[PDB]
Design a protein around this nucleic acid. Structure first.
Ligand SMILES: [Mg+2]
Ligand SMILES: [Mg+2]
Ligand SMILES: [Mg+2]
Ligand SMILES: [Mg+2]
Ligand SMILES: [Mg+2]
Ligand SMILES: [Mg+2]
Ligand SMILES: [Mg+2]
Ligand SMILES: [Mg+2]
Ligand SMILES: [Mg+2]
Ligand SMILES: [Mg+2]
Ligand SMILES: [Mg+2]
Ligand SMILES: [Mg+2]
Ligand SMILES: [Mg+2]
Ligand SMILES: [Mg+2]
Ligand SMILES: [Mg+2]
Ligand SMILES: [Mg+2]
Ligand SMILES: [Mg+2]
Ligand SMILES: [Mg+2]
Ligand SMILES: [Mg+2]
Ligand SMILES: [Mg+2]
Ligand SMILES: [Mg+2]
Ligand SMILES: [Mg+2]
Ligand SMILES: [Mg+2]
Ligand SMILES: [Mg+2]
Ligand SMILES: [Mg+2]
Ligand SMILES: [Mg+2]
Ligand SMILES: [Mg+2]
Ligand SMILES: [Mg+2]
Ligand SMILES: [Mg+2]
Ligand SMILES: [Mg+2]
Ligand SMILES: [Mg+2]
Ligand SMILES: [Mg+2]
Ligand SMILES: [Mg+2]
Ligand SMILES: [Mg+2]
Ligand SMILES: [Mg+2]
Ligand SMILES: [Mg+2]
Ligand SMILES: [Mg+2]
Ligand SMILES: [Mg+2]
Lengths: 262, 149, 151, 129, 141
RNA sequence: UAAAGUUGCUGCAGUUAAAAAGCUCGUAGUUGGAUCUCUCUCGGCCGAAGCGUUUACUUUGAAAAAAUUAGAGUGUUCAAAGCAGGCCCGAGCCGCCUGGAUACCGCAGCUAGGAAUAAUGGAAUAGGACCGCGGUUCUAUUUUGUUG
RNA sequence: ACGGGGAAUCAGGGUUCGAUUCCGGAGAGGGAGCCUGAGAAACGGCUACCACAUCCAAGGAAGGCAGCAGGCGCGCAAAUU
């Protein structure tokens, strides 16, 4: 090509959007924003496919142009806005609040939260650097740059940001024994406790996690997001507590639910 | 079978099972080593030394008595030839065949045997280069062969 | 003298050698401070690099290069170019149909720093990847280990 | 020249088994041969054997019971993964009710079933049934 | 015998690649001389102009006169002898007509008593010979 | 494409049906006889650091586009398909429940155990290991409450 | 001979195909050189040469369907201006 591409084929879209094949040829290409194209959820997909508020793309635009949707406390009229992990979506017209959290299947879930909880979010520290005049600067996973952070905050830590003022309230250090969620790879959507960290100079580090039931797995260091200190998360969790079931026990649960239905 | 002959003979030596020195042998290790040194100073290859010891002094196996082989004993003392005895014999035989062949131009059999002998010499020289017994520049040349041995 | 062999002056860019001083400190010794660095990954700096006087901008220890990427190994085969040698890497390629292997080789032109001396043909060399130093050179010699026949 | 000792030993055993002999003499000995004979004896195909110890490579005298149909070796020693074992079982064994493929694994020298139980692969040495 | 070493893959593959050339059909399909010599050039059918009508004597021990036509192909201009298979179909073909010609069924090899004939006529004047023979369609005229 | 075990790695033939060089030497290639049953220190038993003479092999783990193939669920009236759907209504006029799994993905490159098989390695002119003891030269930090 | 994801046939091995809706590459009759722009050596942009080719009052002016239809030719071989 001679420049940036502006379209997205529907079959080439991320598979966690759960788009069907026969609806059309194209899929909504996410706009540039805080989150990556392959790791976000466009506003239209969440607004018409997840919540069933709109039937077509035109109704999504008619909803958005009434300035009803807010993302992280700010009104967004873009229907392809990239909304990502640990983001807060507010609809004051219906009085609803949602937080984008992966489920155990690796898909963003419709997770309703209390309006009191909708006032803050968690962010992962991506970069620490000193700028002009010797002022420290901290860069998070969602492109937020914060000046004068706490001197004890380093990379791979978690900070709590108040969405109204955009300032750090407290933080969680990256240490063994804390609670973490996997944000990418084969174990995406799983929640557990960090066991140990393997350091490989010049390469990727590997971190081992063990869930509540005792199942152990491993991931890369870049795919881990610290949620809470110890066993207590600092956010509300979805229906599944982050434990991945096998196919056999999913079948058993489904059959038990069917037997008790009726 | 033979390396350069169709023959498939089986004649060789069979050492006894026991490795203990016989009771009748009165010689000690030092006396055997002194005999070996005297024979080597007389100008005998280790094979001839072993033959003499077996035939005359009742020394069935020096390695059983002294715990060491003839060549290693000579090297420890320092009375060892620069190049191994087998390669020396091969080069001497090649020199003799080449000297015969120059006066007899029509002896094609001598040419064939000389080719075989030189092939064996090359094999042995490469093996000794691998073990660093010879420097990694030693070469067998027909002209130099007379001076070599 | 021996170092200055080119039409241009050979200097270490990060060392300032014209700092003026009193006449008492000039008599002592005209010893330029050497510039060197640790390349990381557990490789140690050869003593000849720290104590040497050679000038080489492509040296991994006293030059302006960065070692990042893959770390490979080879056997020295040719030493005929200036500060760069040719090594050979041997391997086996698997053929699925016959369930067997075939012998294959590759040749690499790598940069050899003056700090490494007494390097002979047939010894093992550990090289690391860097930015392209020339048309065909992308690796720099990091460690040299002698052959099995060393005495 | 002789390049495989297990092949010669197995060929000698098979030839002596075809002729109805009671004892077989196999030389030279080797610990791989001893392991193979032990694996065969644990399943009752050969019986007790005795190692004659001369000071050079040893010899073995093996008693025969007449239960051995075919014992053979596979050359070269192919690497066998645990998921490719069934293909070798189909190709080499006569039935699924008897017969054993002999493997050398990191745990030791054993049969294919014991390697399935221990969940390990290795290199194929031979077979017997 | 054959080499059974563990590192002999190159030798085995090279030997098989070289000994595949002694197969008649593989060499015929991969050499390119047969394709160059084929009048159709690899096509299933062709169109030609009937130069004339000929009669070919059947090979012994059979005795007959097989009716054929000499035609010239339109794409390359080569001359071809084609067979008109039926009882009395040679009266459906006129000179200077356009005909569709296909193979005889043995991939360039002669079939039956007819010597050196490997093509047959399918349609004449853009109508199939079967329709004319069965009286379903008439000559355009 | 199978039939073709008539291209034969699995798995073909070479006395007479097509076939082994007139004979020997020899480089490359291929193949190759037996044998050998974690560690001090520094820090809070574990943590750091050296590991392993190294590999090959095997078993794990991570990263690995969808679509297709395999495969779980689902009465498109069946099926090829699709990713949909189900439940009570006194009507929920705040409608409720649920799916959109999983397996495979060769070679090469990462990761952690195994130590049989197969390569390779050490002490022979002992300028070889281990525990110590004297002699000389060259530079850095700290302590003499600070500063020379 | 555009490359792969793949397709046909297949006991176990394997043989053949992949222009073609997805991911990369290249091209706009053949070459070459550029302006603008964040991004082009762009051709539903420009400037020349080479080959074709349209209108003309003979002084000049204007070209690029391997985009959708459609037309000629080519062929065994493929749809509505
Ligand atoms: Mg395009
Ligand atoms: Mg867009
Ligand atoms: Mg020979
Ligand atoms: Mg003899
Ligand atoms: Mg195979
Ligand atoms: Mg013929
Ligand atoms: Mg006949
Ligand atoms: Mg007749
Ligand atoms: Mg076929
Ligand atoms: Mg078959
Ligand atoms: Mg045939
Ligand atoms: Mg078979
Ligand atoms: Mg045949
Ligand atoms: Mg014949
Ligand atoms: Mg002959
Ligand atoms: Mg050779
Ligand atoms: Mg061996
Ligand atoms: Mg993939
Ligand atoms: Mg896929
Ligand atoms: Mg192709
Ligand atoms: Mg082409
Ligand atoms: Mg198959
Ligand atoms: Mg078949
Ligand atoms: Mg394709
Ligand atoms: Mg293609
Ligand atoms: Mg083409
Ligand atoms: Mg272009
Ligand atoms: Mg075009
Ligand atoms: Mg054109
Ligand atoms: Mg042009
Ligand atoms: Mg612009
Ligand atoms: Mg252009
Ligand atoms: Mg156009
Ligand atoms: Mg264009
Ligand atoms: Mg068109
Ligand atoms: Mg047009
Ligand atoms: Mg058609
Ligand atoms: Mg047409």
């Amino acid at each position: 090509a001679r420049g940036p591409k502006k379209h997205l084929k529907r079959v080439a879209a991320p598979k966690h959007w759960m788009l069907d094949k026969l609806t059309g040829v194209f899929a909504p290409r996410p706009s540039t924003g805080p989150h990556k194209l392959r790791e976000c959820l466009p506003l239209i997909i969440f607004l018409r496919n997840r919540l069933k508020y709109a039937l077509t793309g035109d109704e999504v635009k008619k909803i958005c142009m009434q300035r009803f949707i807010k993302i992280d406390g700010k009104v967004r009229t873009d229907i392809t806005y990239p909304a990502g992990f640990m983001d807060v979506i507010s609809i004051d017209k219906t009085g609803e609040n949602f937080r984008l959290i992966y489920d155990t299947k690796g898909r963003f879930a419709v997770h309703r939260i209390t309006p009191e909880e909708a006032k803050y979010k968690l962010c992962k520290v991506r970069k620490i650097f000193v700028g002009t005049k010797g002022i420290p600067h901290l860069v998070t996973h969602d492109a937020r740059t914060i000046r004068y952070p706490d001197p004890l905050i380093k990379v791979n830590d978690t900070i709590q940001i108040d969405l109204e003022t955009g300032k750090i309230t407290d933080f969680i250090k990256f240490d063994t024994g804390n609670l973490c969620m996997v944000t990418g790879g084969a174990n995406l959507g799983r929640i557990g406790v960090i066991t140990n960290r393997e350091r490989h100079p010049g390469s990727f580090d590997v971190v081992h996690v063990k869930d509540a039931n005792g199942n152990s797995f491993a991931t890369r260091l870049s795919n881990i997001f610290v949620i809470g200190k110890g066993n207590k998360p600092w956010i509300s969790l979805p229906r599944g507590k982050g434990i991945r079931l096998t196919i056999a026990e999913e079948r058993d649960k489904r059959l038990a639910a069917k037997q008790s239905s009726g | 079978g033979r390396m350069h002959a169709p023959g498939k003979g089986l004649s060789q030596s069979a050492l006894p099972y026991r490795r203990s020195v016989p009771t009748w042998l009165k010689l000690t290790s030092d006396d055997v080593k002194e005999q070996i040194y005297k024979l080597a100073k007389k100008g005998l290859t280790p094979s001839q030394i072993g033959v003499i010891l077996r035939d005359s002094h009742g020394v069935a196996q020096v390695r059983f008595v002294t715990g060491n082989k003839i060549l290693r004993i000579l090297k420890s003392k320092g009375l060892a030839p620069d190049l191994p005895e087998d390669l020396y014999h091969l080069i001497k035989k090649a020199v003799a065949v080449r000297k015969h062949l120059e006066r007899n131009r029509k002896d094609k059999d001598a040419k064939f045997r000389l080719i075989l002998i030189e092939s064996r010499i090359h094999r042995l020289a490469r093996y000794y280069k691998t073990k660093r017994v010879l420097p990694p520049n030693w070469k067998y040349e027909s002209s130099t062969a007379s001076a070599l041995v | 003298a021996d170092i200055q062999t080119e039409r241009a002056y050979q200097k270490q860019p990060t060392i300032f050698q014209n700092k003026k001083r009193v006449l008492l400190g000039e008599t002592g010794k005209e010893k330029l401070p050497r510039y060197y660095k640790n390349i990381g990954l557990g490789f140690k700096t050869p003593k000849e690099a720290i104590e040497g006087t050679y000038i080489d901008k492509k040296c991994p220890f006293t030059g302006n290069v960065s070692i990042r990427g893959r770390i490979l190994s080879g056997v020295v085969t040719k030493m005929k170019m200036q500060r760069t040698i040719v090594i050979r890497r041997d391997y086996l390629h698997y053929i699925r149909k016959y369930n067997r292997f075939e012998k294959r080789h590759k040749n690499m032109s790598v940069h050899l720093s003056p700090c490494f001396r007494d390097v002979q043909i047939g010894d093992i060399v550990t090289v690391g990847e860097c930015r392209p130093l020339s048309k065909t050179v992308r690796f720099n010699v990091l460690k040299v280990t002698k052959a099995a026949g060393t005495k | 020249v002789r390049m495989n000792v297990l092949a010669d030993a197995l060929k000698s055993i098979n030839n002596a088994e075809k002729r109805g002999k009671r004892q077989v003499l196999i030389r030279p000995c080797s610990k791989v041969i001893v392991r193979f004979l032990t694996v065969m004896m644990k399943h009752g195909y050969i019986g007790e054997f005795e190692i004659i110890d001369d000071h050079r490579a040893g010899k073995i005298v093996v008693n025969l019971t007449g239960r051995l149909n075919k014992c053979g070796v596979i050359s070269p020693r192919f690497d066998v993964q645990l998921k490719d074992l069934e293909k070798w079982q189909n190709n080499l064994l006569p039935s699924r009710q008897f017969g054993f493929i002999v493997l050398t694994t990191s745990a030791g020298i054993m049969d294919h079933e014991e390697a399935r139980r221990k969940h390990t692969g290795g290199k194929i040495l031979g077979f017997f049934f | 015998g054959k080499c059974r070493g563990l590192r002999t893959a190159r030798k085995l593959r090279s030997h098989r690649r070289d000994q595949k050339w002694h197969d008649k059909q593989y060499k015929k399909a991969h050499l390119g001389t047969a394709l160059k010599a084929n009048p159709f050039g690899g096509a299933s059918h062709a169109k030609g102009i009937v130069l004339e009508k000929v009669g070919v004597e059947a090979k012994q021990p059979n005795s007959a006169i097989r009716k054929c036509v000499r035609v010239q192909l339109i794409k390359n201009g080569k001359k071809i002898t084609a067979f008109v298979p039926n009882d009395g179909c040679l009266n459906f073909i006129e000179e200077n007509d356009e005909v569709l010609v296909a193979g005889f069924g043995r991939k360039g090899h002669a079939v039956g008593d007819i010597p050196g004939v490997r093509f047959k006529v399918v349609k004449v004047a853009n109508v199939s010979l079967l329709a004319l023979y069965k009286g379903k369609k008439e000559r355009p005229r």
